[PDB]
Design an enzyme around this catalytic site. Structure first.
Site, short mmCIF file in Angstrom:
data_model
loop_
_atom_site.label_atom_id
_atom_site.label_comp_id
_atom_site.label_asym_id
_atom_site.label_seq_id
_atom_site.Cartn_x
_atom_site.Cartn_y
_atom_site.Cartn_z
N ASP A 273 30.94 -66.43 142.54
CA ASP A 273 31.98 -66.92 141.63
C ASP A 273 31.88 -66.15 140.32
O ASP A 273 30.82 -65.63 139.99
CB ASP A 273 31.82 -68.43 141.42
CG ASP A 273 32.74 -68.97 140.31
OD1 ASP A 273 33.96 -68.80 140.37
OD2 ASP A 273 32.20 -69.57 139.36
N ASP B 26 33.64 -66.97 136.75
CA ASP B 26 33.53 -67.80 135.55
C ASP B 26 32.48 -68.91 135.73
O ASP B 26 32.55 -69.72 136.66
CB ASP B 26 34.88 -68.42 135.21
CG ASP B 26 34.96 -68.95 133.79
OD1 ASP B 26 34.76 -68.15 132.85
OD2 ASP B 26 35.12 -70.17 133.63
MG LIG Z 1 32.98 -70.88 138.19
#
Ligand SMILES: [Mg+2]
Ligand SMILES: O=P([O-])(O)O[C@H]1O[C@H](COP(=O)(O)O)[C@@H](O)[C@H](O)[C@H]1O
Ligand SMILES: [Cl-]
Ligand SMILES: [Mg+2]
Ligand SMILES: [Mg+2]
Ligand SMILES: [Mg+2]
Ligand code: NA
Ligand code: NA
Ligand code: NA
Lengths: 242, 242
Positions: free
Chosen positions: B8, B10
């Site tokens: 992932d 962010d």
């Molecule tokens: Mg995230």
């Protein structure tokens, strides 16, 4: 007596779609030593800044983006209105509800998003959706010529909302504008009228019927002048003020 | 066998709403000497470029903006997908038409604009319109909690379309998303499951139900590790890969 010059921007101070030239920028600043100057356009403040400069509110005594729905005098923002406060929430929703239902029944090659764009001084309504790609925009523009989609839509809205104080206008390729009667370029005159000017001159390149300068030009509060190009604007200013 | 680490972006490689640091970027390039790496995020390529660097496709073996609907492998575009191509324009238009007509019948205190936001991987649908103000968002959500506006709307959509392979997900204060089944972060697994990896590690910070890493975390094809912050991801990587 004390007077003011109000200028359309695009096509009048600038070649269509261009920044102003430094020569014309210097000319207007010399003109401003003899008379107050102001600019008015349908585009938003950021576009006005791109065409005339980031320091526009310091270089012009009045700046009226969005036909004046945003208005600067002497560098500061004046009091503001918006479509929902002027028309009321009930008429706004009736207009939106109608347009949404109508668009749902239009048969198109493609539909996308942002069918209704809610702006300070208008609703912009697009049957395809403003988020369409450039390819899709041209496909729609081309089909619309062939099928009269926007023209029929606006003709239907004019009958449905007869009497409710709205004006409809098709512009560009994918949309039309719905706005309160009088929120064309004449809107800005509220901020200059009966404010000590013995004459308010206006200069614009689309003063013909259907053009975006027609109503402010024909308004009795302005001494209107139709220009054919920025060089013609400068010609008239040198005649009147020099 | 050979393995892949999928991150992932962010909250996992970066602090929330922040750009990757030079130090983290260096760490990943060292980690990449030991194991292939890939990034997946919900945002579009331009935003991924803002978060990770404009040269992002050169720094990771796979880059998956928009949950993998856009896929880069070894610096070149592997594949692009979007909702209109997958569903077809007829179905797109039937969905949009149904939502426009339905929203036209919802009684609300206010309606604004952008009722349908068209994105490559979903339609975001808002009875009030996404352009509304934060104050208007709160007003709407209060009415929605008592009138179940969005719940009934999604219920009726589920009856009419879900046999077309669509998921509907309510979230936040004013909207719901409509998207093809499986077009969450799992979508990107199709682009790596054929490349001979014995383990696909996944690191994300929102791995609980509701979070945007939950489905990919729970997918049997990944070895999922929940992380509270970038520093936590780094501590885990130290123990896993030295
Ligand atoms: Mg995230
Ligand atoms: O092209 P669109 O539909 O995005 O429309 C755009 O440009 C039009 C004017 O364009 P012109 O002066 O060239 O006729 C405007 O009416 C419209 O508000 C604006 O969104
Ligand atoms: Cl919309
Ligand atoms: Mg003009
Ligand atoms: Mg006049
Ligand atoms: Mg798993
Ligand atoms: Na703008
Ligand atoms: Na009228
Ligand atoms: Na596959």
């Amino acid at each position: 007596g004390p007077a003011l010059c109000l200028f359309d921007v695009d096509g009048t101070l600038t070649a269509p779609r261009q920044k102003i030239t430094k020569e014309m920028d210097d000319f207007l600043q010399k003109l401003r030593q003899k008379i107050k100057i102001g600019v008015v356009g349908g585009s938003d403040f950021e576009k006005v800044q791109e065409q005339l400069g980031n320091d526009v509110v310091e270089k012009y005594d009045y700046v009226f983006p969005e036909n004046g729905l945003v208005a600067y005098k002497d560098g500061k923002l004046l009091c503001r209105q918006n479509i929902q406060s002027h028309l009321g929430e009930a008429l706004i929703q009736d207009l939106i509800n109608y347009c949404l239902s109508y668009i749902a029944k239009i048969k198109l090659p493609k539909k996308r998003g942002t069918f209704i764009e809610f702006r300070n001084g208008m609703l912009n309504v697009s049957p395809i959706g403003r988020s369409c790609s450039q390819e899709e925009r041209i496909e729609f523009y081309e089909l619309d010529k062939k099928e009269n989609i926007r023209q029929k839509f606006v003709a239907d809205l004019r009958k449905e909302f007869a009497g409710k104080g709205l004006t409809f206008s098709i512009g560009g390729q994918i949309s039309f504008d719905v706005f309160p009667d009088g929120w064309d370029k004449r809107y800005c005159l509220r901020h200059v009228e009966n404010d000590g000017y013995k004459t308010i001159y206006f200069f614009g390149d689309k003063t013909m019927p259907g053009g975006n300068d027609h109503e402010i030009f024909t308004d009795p509060r302005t001494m209107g002048y139709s220009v054919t190009a920025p060089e013609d604007m400068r010609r008239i200013c040198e005649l009147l003020f020099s």
